[model samples]
Target chain A: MTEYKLVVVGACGVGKSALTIQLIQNHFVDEYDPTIEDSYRKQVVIDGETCLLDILDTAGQEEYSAMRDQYMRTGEGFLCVFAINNTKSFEDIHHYREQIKRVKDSEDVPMVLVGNKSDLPSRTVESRQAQDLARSYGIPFIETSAKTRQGVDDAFYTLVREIRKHKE
Target chain B: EQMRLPSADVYRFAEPDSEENIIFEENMQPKAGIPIIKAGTVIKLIERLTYHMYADPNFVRTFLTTYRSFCKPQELLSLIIERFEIPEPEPSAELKRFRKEYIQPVQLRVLNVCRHWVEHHFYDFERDAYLLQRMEEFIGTVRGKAMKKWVESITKIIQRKKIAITFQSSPPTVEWHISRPGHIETFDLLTLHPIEIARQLTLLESDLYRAVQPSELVGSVWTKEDKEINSPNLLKMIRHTTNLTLWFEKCIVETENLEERVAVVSRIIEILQVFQELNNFNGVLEVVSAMNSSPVYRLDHTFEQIPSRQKKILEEAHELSEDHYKKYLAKLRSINPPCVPFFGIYLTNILKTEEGNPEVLKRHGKELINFSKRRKVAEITGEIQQYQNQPYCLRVESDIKRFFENLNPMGNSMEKEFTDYLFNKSLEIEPRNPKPLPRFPKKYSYPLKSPGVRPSNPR
Candidate 1:
């Protein structure tokens, strides 16, 4: 079985924990408890192949900004979460990408730009717009809804595949 | 009523030699309830079904049900079953099971049944057909045509596409500097007072209204449909307002504990009150809508948990925003000029008055425009002009647009389901013991490492 370490990051309150919980544990968190640090390990099968996946659900607050370098260094892949209804989080994804590249010392880091909260009708960021941004960064882009559990699994599975492909 | 083939080709097949197969030869003929054309050939009819309904199995079933009087459902069912006859030579149990589970029942229903008798059988055929990729070509054609129509419809109305002219290329663009300033080390949303929150929202409101061109409102009939096409700026403002309101509700959802949920709700109400004081009725109504949204309203426990004083304030806000906003309009007119009226409220006011008469003047024999009504429009228009003229004075280091983006709306139906799921889960988990107050930092301490340095992505 292939093994990979994935990190989830975004500006505060972008549903990083919700996305991870929905993906790994099949549960959604309603209350926003600012994450200090949380990790989960699971074995999931994607495309009929099994993989051991370790996920690091990082804090979105700027107070944790200093600690991101260490997290980036350790993460094999990244899922950058942005609330589709939130443009600020989408705008700062490039900054996060740049940070990841500098810390990892490699440009070709396995990454996925996730536009979360897609179930909301009043979305600030369009999937097409996010797709373009992800294209510019040479990463896959998918919209996920932690609330509805839409695209949650695809996000994790895609990252794992990218990590495996990157190793090759 | 005479039973005629639905199409000329339905009766004909095999190019030169038209052999009588299925519908043409079988006893499927019209003896009707609801009138329908006969299926001359089963192939032609199935093609029609696939083209017309594609993946909508319900529609396909309904089509068969409605036209059952004209077509012999038994004949059609037997013909289809014959095509997928199971091989006799040592057939696998799984194939036998699929045949038994899906195919055999369909046969029995078609042979002896009324409306919807073959519904389950048809679904089995559909699943089997889907696995065979039988619908792929038709689906592709339908999807292509649908996409083309959608693009044409959108592009037909939009004459100009606004493009943002950027000064920087590649990753570390200068826009980042303007958006995220280095000096502001950390802005913890939980710490912000409601008044401070209102100030941040005002910045977004100011930006939205400032960007509105005067031409965007002219000749706008103010119908919900016309408003979007004629007043694009106002449309954007309305959308932004809705999203901004949702963001506040999202914050309430984010609060982990019950104490924080009530506090968040109270803080949002306070912010709405502040917006009301500032004459930002649009923001006030948006916030009101968000609070009263099903996701929040359905949280009966949370509402019950709110302080009665805050609940009273919420009720007043609700009263003002409800039923065409008569209360809001009354309040708007009673207030003086330096106030910024929500453009939507006044546009609606002018529209209702406009629909009553032809022109601004009128006489008994000779008709004239409604002069007084015209003045009302002009007066509202003038207030809008004056409101736009006012400059945005406040500035904060935080990217307020980003702040708005960080906020998620929680009032959607699916969101309610998720919340219900979460609430149920929480009920099972052990109650968290309240943590000490020292954890709540007064101000986020940032040890800056030359943060002002320009984004270093090689341009």
Candidate 2:
């Protein structure tokens, strides 16, 4: 299987775990057990090819804030996630952006700006600013919902595509 | 002979011939193949649901997980039963063969799907008493002997799962607390070995996190904790982090002498190392936050006086806690726990899940409970309970636990009075330079504006 070590980064509670769980499991993990190892490892078939997504989700623990460099060093592509309903999480996107750029020591890297939580009735982080941010940075922007499943698949698939096309 | 019914059934049996050699071909594998369940009539979903269980379990899994959002529990229980009932065509020999080759297998598939749904998501039946009532009603009216066995197995599991969610809510006992001590003498932070402080904090915080009911996490309910029954344990856990951080800050800020101030900072650094070794990341964060906070950080002369090795560890803690804690997250997953997982992560996840997903979902023109959101919150809480299941090994000193738990730094209120006292004290030791950078907290709850109360009374 061609594996993608995709890392999901965002402000705390930006629905990183939710989006990842929806993508890999195709359902909400009603009761999550943090100890299980297999939940992060999955085999998927997309566009007639085998793929493995080794998602780094535990980064939410922030106790692992020390390991961002190692993850950024190895992460083929990053899905920078934040909730559309929370502006602060959106504002903090640059923190991950700065961290990733510093670790890679490059002008640009493979990334997809994921503004998740489209299912929310109201949005604090408007799509306009999100689109503008993605455009200014020259990356793909996708609004997603793990609940409604809108753009959830494309967020991963598009990031994988970006990773494949990028120069290491 | 063909027996006519009210409407045309797609799988109707053809007429049987009197000849013994009458040929009847049963196409078990159809050319078009099995399909995904789509939004439509309940009957269509039932057929798709049962058939896919036999072929495409992927669809079945999705359907079972989400069907509750569309169909009521009793509604599905009755439909699956109705779909399982395929009446006989006639007494003819060929017809019996047709029933076996075609109808009987789909009936078996229904039973299997029902069993799988019950086995994995039994909470569905247990949550709604009426759903189980309908299931039992079908079992009593059931005519097929083999079918009854399958439903009975599901019933047995339903009863077992009924008890599964009823886990006891008590904290670990004192006997468990007194088993093995790393250090036995005092509860003092400065005097005790770092290992002793960390272990006591670990077991103490472990019990705090373990005692939290998963429900306390949903919707970030700890904030709306105005009622007596509302998230008391969760509030204690939250306040514990606040107070723990405050305790560390005060310990460093209260040291007036430069030499002893550096000593206090270094000793606290050693305690943080114990927290790191113990996998008590929450304790580590609390201590690090204190060291980096303005009051302690402003004391420049003390940082200079601190020992090189200890100062280096403080720098590492700063690195681990900075950058939105991605590095600390990396540290957390790699370790096997008997550790205190920083509760802030779980709290943030719950907050996001609640805010991101709508509470009321629209399905078939009716506003249904967005159970899908609960699953996400439950997943986050489930992660908490996973760590809770693993027990910490160290023995506790009750006085230490008492002192540790009640450290209720009035500074913990995060009020200006306490922070100013600490900051002025920091200035007294060493004045601030021209400028500096910013500070952070549990980002999920930035403006906590909470009239934060200490868990323990003023001593």
Candidate 3:
């Protein structure tokens, strides 16, 4: 189990909590569960290696932006959440590289670009374009689904793996 | 009338070399009216059943081992039993037969992932009752070639009477963004693929179509308001973009509202040139001329062709301009829609700048520590409790645990299922072809007709 702090930040209704909840709890909330209004911290221990891990899932709305930013300041790695079904969320992406640039003195942070809500096949935001955008931003991009839990763990693990290389 | 009743004897029941009698094969398995394809036993299929329909079992096992030591049998059972709100699997034959029987009736609702997931996870199964009634509509509604595939699989299940078997089923969800108020030019920008959506709106005929026309289904838009809409042909697009919201990512447009058609056509030509160069195609001149005739999409910016080998491909891609323009015009005219432009980059930058270092958190952190005595949780767990000003580090461990556990099945199965659909299975494997664009060119010789289409054999 590797340690990771993957934040889920975006506009309102972008499925930040839903994705975090789905990844951690394996369930979806129609209404906001408010399980992670301020911040989300969790640890995962590998069964055999007893590898301990830390994960942080942040909020994605303007109201929660302050707290999310605080958590980002403390996070070791980041997993940027973009909704495939919501163009605004995809369009709302922060100047990805610029966002990374904001944290002064920070080495290249291991970043994973995630397009949540992957289980749905039809109503997609510009996915390939999103992929291309993420590629340009120099981060790994994966389509995810909180409802179906697609790429939930992989997104986290990939970031942790990348963070370790940088941490070294 | 010679109607051949389906039986296992002559069909061989999934095996090409079996000599078993049809009646004997039918009699061998206990039938609860569901068609079992191989080994003819409910237990056999169940034994092979994995948690996620599209995931690999091995990946699931590896995923499971990372969290809990092992997958509890009871957990597996819960997953198998909960799909579709019923415990039993649908008869494979019924599903298979239904595919052929209801080919015309099936309607696919192509939803982007977010809304799709919402429908699947949050909505009750009863909401899809209309889909059950009109399978063809359900089949037609799906957005991607990937999704159309699941419909194909369901069709096979019905034909094989496998519906009686109950196992884990993870259906995809949808997310919608754009909202068209009315119709636009002849083209329906709503129906364009994500990458091509930008290009499709370059040329349009006014008075021909509207966005989000009166009869259009509300599922067309891919995103809700997350940002402001942009498009040079906003008026033309907005007529069809009915559901207005601030969160849209990009706006689909038409040529009608645009003041300058020539400039727009020129831009279209340039972009087509890029696409043709990349894919090895032709047709730039046609695009420029076709776009010039549109009601909207003015080319304000100068067109500068990049000097490269792609120039030839761009020439070839030019041929598609006329066909694409005609098709697009028809679509926009069919639906009077209002389209959105890409959200301005400034918004994202401004938000990030404002929130990058809010002083509130720094002040709050210090005050909270002064007010409360922090108690340590499991060192490995990182749990802390905060009462009032007390800031406790609450590890959303359960949430994280559930996330991995929940997706373990679906993630595990996705590859195998997707591979089968994209590579292993034939286009004919499903009763219908999933491609929205025609898979072939008209002039290609036999056995090589559709270059865009995957060959009968993946290799």
lDDT of 3 by residue, A40-143 (tens): 34455433333334444433223212122233454567777777777766776754334443432244677778887744445567678877887877778877
Give the per-residue lDDT digits (tens) of candidate 2, residues B113-176. Answer: 7777777666667567777776667666755765678767867876777683221343322321
**Which of the numbered candidates is closest to the native, going by highest lDDT?**
2
lDDT of each: 0.53, 0.64, 0.33
Candidate 1 lDDT tens digits, B1-459: 321212334322111212232222233223422222222244444432332112323324434433332344445544433322323223155556544543443333322221233222343233344422422232223223324543343333222221121223232222231113443334434444355556567766766766664334323332324555646666666667756655655665555456556666766777777677667766776677566543354455568877787688788977874433458768976875434455554543344333322332222333322223333344445556666756434444255446564554444555335444433333322132342321222222322112221323555
Arrange candidates by lDDT, descending: 2, 1, 3
Tens-place lDDT per residue, model 3, B1-459, is 222223334221222222221111143213333222222122222222321112233222222222111223333233323221211223265555444332212212112211232222222122444433343344444454645666565545333432331213431111111322221221221221222322222212111122212101111111234222321232233322211110010111222222222223333444454333322111222232222211111222212322343334433443332321233333323432222111111122222222221111112222111000000001101110011122111112222223212222123444225223322222222112233311222321222111121112321
TM-scores, all candidates, are: 0.35, 0.51, 0.27
Candidate with the greatest TM-score versus the true structure = 2
When sorted by TM-score, best at the front, the candidate numbers are: 2, 1, 3
Fraction of native A-B contacts kept, per candidate:
0.00, 0.01, 0.00
Error of 2 at B248 (Å): 2.1
lDDT of 2 at B443: 16
